[PDB]
């Protein structure tokens, strides 16, 4: 006369990263190494109209 353990079940997590989501259509990635080429986190632009 016994008792049974009918199953063991675990969810598995998968991911689909940032460059795969379509929210990235809006922004452009960069190195972050050449953030050290600019000084003080600034970038100048001479825009002519």
């Amino acid at each position: 006369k016994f008792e049974v353990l009918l199953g063991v079940y675990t969810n598995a997590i998968q991911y689909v990263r940032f460059l795969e989501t379509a929210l990235a259509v809006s922004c452009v990635n960069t190195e972050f190494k050449d953030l050290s080429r600019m000084t003080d986190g600034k970038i100048q632009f001479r825009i002519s109209v």
């Binding site: 960069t30 190195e31 050449d34 080429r37």
Partner: peptide, 22 residues
């Protein structure tokens, strides 16, 4: 001469040199 500095940001600013450049 103005190249050799960046990894990619110089490629981002554009290459045409009639519209944008360093």
């Amino acid at each position: 001469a103005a190249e050799g500095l960046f990894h990619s940001f110089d490629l981002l600013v554009g290459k045409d040199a009639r519209e944008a450049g360093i």
